[PDB]
Design a protein around this ligand. Structure first.
Ligand SMILES: *[C@H]1O[C@H](CO)[C@H](O)[C@H](O)[C@H]1F
Ligand SMILES: [Mg+2]
Ligand SMILES: [Mg+2]
Ligand code: NA
Ligand code: NA
Ligand code: NA
Ligand code: NA
Lengths: 1011, 204
């Protein structure tokens, strides 16, 4: 049969899909969500063996353990145990495209388990096994006998073992195929793995049972009244004495309850459903569910006899909430949402695609503390617990069918084929069927990157029909097809159009008002967080805030998909595409997260947190206007703290309780602020603090901030004439300057400050030279390989123009003496193949104070690609423990990623000055610095800088962080100007014009000295 | 203007004058100007200017220099945007090239008088035997900003002795989305706080 190469066959003997069951036999257990005895885990220690193909499987296997098998933990991904390689491919299918066939060499994993079944279970009722996630397809046997088959790796496959079990010891044989025709619908850009990766369990149901239940909450115009409607379906023998009781609880308080025997209303000419019943519960002033206040009720569904005897109980958490699109806006409980979302894969650097509750919880808490309110299940139904936690902590969820056919040509090749409708249908239907009772799910998604075909229209229609409670969205085929209630593009830019044929990506602001367009717009993917990215994040936030119809989006993505590997030494390292021998592969493309695989944030996370803030401020004079973007809660666990500093010197602070209603304003008058004895800029900083701990944060959690410049008093004070004057020692090869214990040397061949001495210690390992390039960010690179270039990538443009290859050609080097200083003047040209790219004119003024003032003026040829930077660099001989500076911080920040940073005086261990992106590049810059202190050195001006033990060249030359080696001394990169980092996407130039170094002429001035 | 410093140095091939001034109002330092004048054996005077603008003072209208030339010449020739009046937020129409007009075309006779005649993106300006080089904006006429500012009807203007030259490293947008509320877009406001420019003044 080769059922795995036939889309017409997606399962054999599978039971119908339904919401989470537990078959309690005690209503209070049910009520309380206590553990149910009728439901048990088979997770743990299994027997497993790997074969290169199903045809290599021995018959005996059904019969008895293979001696050679190994004891492994289940659930797991076999690649995570070393049986074969996990493969990292983005678009290109990991197998030959030739549906519905797969390779003859089709890695097969033979799992088996010997376990005990109790007689009680077999005397009566029904016993089924549930495999939450089996990737990609599998055949099942019990005690030697064949039970069934099943496809779709991301939804539960269930089978009736009732007739297969013996009391005592029993044997399960599970033949899992890596590749099946299902794989053609599983082309997500992530690691390609396989096995029994989700729970395995046994559920006992009575013969007469609750086979399905649907919960609906409808409301009146002002939400003061609601009706909970619950449709209940049974299986088993219908009897007049059978009944259903549905009850609702607000905690320990029974809110409502209703009983009725079976038998639905007339549906049509043949009658109604004798085996179903609907209960309707009225609720006055229900407590509404939202991400803001995840108010939940408990619903208990009891199947019993008229005399009070309980057959079984099922139940679920209930959130009263209404989701609907009206007059072009996405409304929740009548209020238009603002989606602060993130896409999230189920990824563990260790466990692979196997998810655990702790990681889930950790993810949710990180999201929430980062001002995230929504998440998209990119790109398939998640492990069942996910929804529960979302229901509980409060996160809006986009539930997505497990359908992605990215690598077909064109993309809709299958989705437009009616012969694929069936397999596709199951992936949609079974999801709705399973998750339709979770309040957290607010939108259904048809899948991802599978073009736009008729199959999508049909399914779009199916959902609308069966679950009018939620909007359906789908980005394929253009983001605004007839199969979507939401314009939900990926990577559409704020102001910039990308008019690709057939599927253009217009500026979001523009998209909304195209002739006849009326839908709301929420990006299904945006601000591609790969490596040093998120440049331009603020531009989106501003726009979302300004246009009602721009209702946010889901950033791409939450966590880097790196996997842990170890070196000889046994030490762990983060791996990516191709690191497992996988090929073809997409290398680092699998790392686009806001946090590293271990959940350590990337610096971009903070930029995301600020921009997603729920309080907005405005300052007028001494008056602060706080505005709340909350729709539902008041600011009841918040205080505003503020503080005034002069140049980092704290001059005054205070707190102020916040008392703003959802969407209201609060003014805060700052008390007269004293006068600073002293030149400089006064800076106001305000943070919103949570005094009390929550379910998602601890007391003192900071949820928002903002800063402003208050008055400024320019300095009009004269240095103060210095006692001594520096001495100029000319020479054939060098201009030397001495001043006390200090010496500066300028190599006349080169035109650069070759060395400096304090006392008898040399200061530099490498001369101080201009720098116009940077170790390329993932955004600079784009898809620019070896096999294939991509001309347009910044990195390509730079390479090609000679940027990395240009060497300095002296044009002038002189020295003069002034009344109180020596003046070194230089001019250099940077050429490539006869083109002068840049010209650097400088002056060094060393005075009686021993301060060297450097003035730089660079000219950039207009027809050369705008440089990554305009600064200087050198290798210092020293290695200090800390870095202290007066500027933007404390975290890494770039020009188009600097809103979250604050201007103040920061001090960190040098290590905190380097950012450990798994794929190395220019990192750790800090902008708007007026003063930098390191070792004996002090630099002052208004520049950007980074400082670490790794040079630009090393960075650019090393593919993996674990391979970096601290160099001798410390590398300092100090820039007058630094180019934006971009990120609207990572595969095309995304650095906005205002952040490009196009001026042609730049001036900067630095003062170097010893403190 | 409050002089903070003024000095003279002798170079290999030149004399260097270094100055610094503080502009204040009611005890407030509004702006700081720091310069060097470098005259070499070639007769070229190179002016380098660095200014600081208090962050809490309103963004200034322009950052430049000005002076009344003794001389009155018939034409003005320049290498930059033109030939007509052009401002920062109103210069797309203008073209960069070599322009040469009668002095008078360098003045815009708006009925209600104001700053006018500016030309941006100039690399070279020649008037009489004078010549200025760099990268700036300038205006030149027989009318001071003060006159312009005190006279409300163009007919009431009177040519002053000599020619007033306004050379700017920087000039604020003129606006106009409306004429009754501030309309200069932020990108056209002189809010950077620190400004630098340099010009070469010489003869020919
Ligand atoms: C949106 O694009 C990103 C690119 O890293 C991923 O491929 C997503 O799965 C896709 F839907
Ligand atoms: Mg099949
Ligand atoms: Mg894809
Ligand atoms: Na909006
Ligand atoms: Na990716
Ligand atoms: Na690199
Ligand atoms: Na006037």
């Amino acid at each position: 049969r080769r059922d795995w190469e036939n889309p017409g066959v997606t399962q054999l003997n599978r039971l119908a899909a339904h919401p989470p069951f537990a078959s309690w036999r005690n209503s209070e257990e049910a009520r309380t969500d206590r553990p149910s005895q009728q439901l048990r885990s088979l997770n743990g220690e299994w027997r497993f063996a790997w074969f290169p193909a199903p045809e290599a499987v021995p018959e005996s296997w059904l019969e008895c353990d293979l001696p050679e098998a190994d004891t492994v933990v289940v659930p797991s991904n076999w690649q995570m145990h070393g049986y074969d390689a996990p493969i990292y491919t983005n678009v290109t299918y990991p197998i030959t495209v030739n549906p519905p066939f797969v390779p003859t060499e089709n890695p097969t994993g033979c799992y088996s388990l010997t376990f005990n079944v109790d007689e009680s279970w077999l005397q009566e009722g029904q016993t089924r096994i549930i495999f939450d996630g089996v990737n990609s397809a599998f055949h099942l046997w019990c005690n030697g006998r064949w039970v069934g088959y099943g496809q779709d790796s991301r939804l539960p496959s269930e089978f009736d073992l009732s007739a297969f079990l013996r009391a005592g010891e029993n044997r399960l044989a599970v033949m899992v195929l890596r590749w099946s025709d299902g794989s053609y619908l599983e082309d997500q850009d992530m690691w390609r793995m396989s096995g029994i990766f989700r729970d395995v369990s046994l559920l006992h149901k009575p013969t007469t049972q609750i086979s399905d239940f649907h919960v609906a909450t409808r409301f009146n115009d002002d939400f003061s009244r609601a009706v909970l409607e619950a449709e209940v379906q049974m299986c088993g023998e219908l009897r007049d004495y059978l009944r259903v009781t549905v009850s609702l609880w607000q905690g320990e308080t029974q809110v409502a309850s209703g009983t009725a025997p079976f038998g639905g209303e007339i549906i049509d000419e043949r009658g109604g459903y004798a085996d179903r019943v609907t209960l309707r519960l009225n609720v006055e002033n229900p407590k509404l569910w939202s991400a803001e206040i995840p108010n939940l009720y408990r619903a208990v569904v009891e199947l019993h006899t008229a005399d009070g005897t309980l057959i079984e109980a099922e139940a679920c958490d209930v959130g009263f909430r209404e989701v609907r699109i009206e007059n072009g806006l996405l409304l929740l409980n009548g209020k238009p949402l603002l989606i602060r979302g993130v896409n999230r894969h189920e990824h563990h650097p260790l466990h692979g695609q196997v998810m655990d509750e702790q990681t889930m919880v950790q993810d949710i808490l990180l999201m929430k503390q980062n001002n995230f309110n929504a998440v998209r299940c990119s790109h398939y139904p998640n492990h069942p617990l996910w929804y529960t936690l979302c229901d509980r902590y409060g996160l809006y969820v986009v539930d997505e069918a497990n359908i992605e056919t990215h690598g077909m040509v064109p993309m809709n090749r299958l989705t437009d084929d009616p012969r694929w409708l069936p397999a596709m249908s199951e992936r949609v239907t079974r999801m709705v069927q399973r998750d339709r009772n979770h309040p957290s799910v607010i939108i259904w998604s048809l899948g991802n990157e599978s073009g736009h075909g008729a199959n999508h229209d049909a399914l779009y229609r199916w959902i609308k029909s069966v679950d009018p409670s939620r909007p359906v969205q789908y980005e394929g085929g253009g983001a605004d097809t007839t199969a979507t209630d939401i314009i939900c593009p990926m990577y559409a830019r704020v102001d910039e159009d990308q008019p690709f044929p057939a599927v253009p990506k217009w500026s979001i602001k523009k998209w909304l008002s195209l002739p006849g367009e009326t839908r709301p717009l929420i990006l299904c993917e945006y601000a591609h967080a790969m490596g040093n990215s998120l440049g331009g994040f603020a531009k989106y936030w501003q726009a979302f805030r300004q246009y009602p119809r721009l209702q946010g989006g889901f950033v791409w993505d939450w966590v880097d998909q790196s996997l842990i590997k170890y070196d000889e030494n046994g030490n762990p390292w983060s791996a990516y595409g191709g690191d497992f021998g996988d090929t073809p592969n997409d290398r680092q493309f699998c790392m686009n997260g806001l946090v590293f695989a271990d959940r350590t944030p990337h610096p971009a996370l903070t930029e995301a947190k600020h921009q997603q803030q729920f309080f907005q401020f405005r300052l007028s004079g001494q008056t602060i206007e706080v505005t709340s973007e909350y729709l539902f809660r008041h600011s009841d666990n918040e205080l505003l703290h503020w503080m005034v500093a002069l140049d980092g010197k704290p001059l005054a602070s205070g707190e102020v309780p916040l008392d703003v209603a959802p969407q209201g304003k609060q003014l805060i008058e700052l008390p007269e602020l004293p006068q600073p004895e002293s030149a400089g800029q006064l800076w106001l900083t305000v943070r919103v603090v949570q005094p009390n701990a929550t379910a998602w944060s601890e007391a003192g959690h900071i949820s928002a901030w903002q800063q402003w410049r208050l008055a400024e008093n320019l300095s009009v004070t004269l240095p103060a004439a210095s006692h001594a004057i520096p001495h100029l020692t000319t020479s054939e090869m060098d201009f030397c300057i001495e001043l006390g214990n200090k010496r500066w040397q300028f190599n006349r061949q080169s035109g650069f400050l070759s060395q400096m001495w304090i006392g008898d210690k040399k200061q530099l390992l490498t001369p101080l030279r201009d720098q116009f390039t940077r170790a390329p960010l993932d955004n600079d690179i784009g898809v620019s390989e070896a096999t294939r270039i991509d001309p347009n990538a910044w990195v390509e443009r730079w390479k090609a123009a000679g940027h990395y290859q240009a060497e300095a050609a002296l044009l002038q080097c002189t020295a003069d003496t002034l009344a109180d200083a020596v003046l070194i003047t230089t001019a250099h040209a940077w050429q490539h193949q006869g083109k002068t790219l840049f010209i650097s004119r400088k002056t060094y003024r060393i005075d009686g104070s021993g301060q060297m003032a450097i003035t730089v003026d660079v000219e950039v040829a207009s027809d050369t690609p705008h440089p990554a930077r305009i600064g200087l660099n050198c290798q210092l001989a020293q290695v200090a423990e800390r870095v202290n500076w007066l500027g933007l911080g404390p975290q890494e920040n770039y020009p188009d990623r600097l809103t979250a940073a604050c201007f103040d005086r920061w001090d960190l261990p040098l290590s905190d000055m380097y950012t450990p992106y798994v794929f190395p590049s220019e990192n750790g810059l800090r902008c708007g610095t007026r003063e930098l202190n390191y070792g004996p050195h002090q630099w002052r001006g208004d520049f950007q800088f980074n400082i670490s033990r790794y040079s630009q060249q090393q960075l650019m030359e090393t593919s993996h962080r674990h391979l970096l080696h601290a160099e001798e001394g410390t590398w300092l990169n100090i820039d007058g100007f630094h180019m934006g980092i971009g990120g609207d996407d990572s595969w095309s130039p995304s650095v906005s014009a205002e952040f490009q170094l196009s001026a042609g002429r730049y001036h900067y001035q630095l003062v170097w000295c010893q403190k």
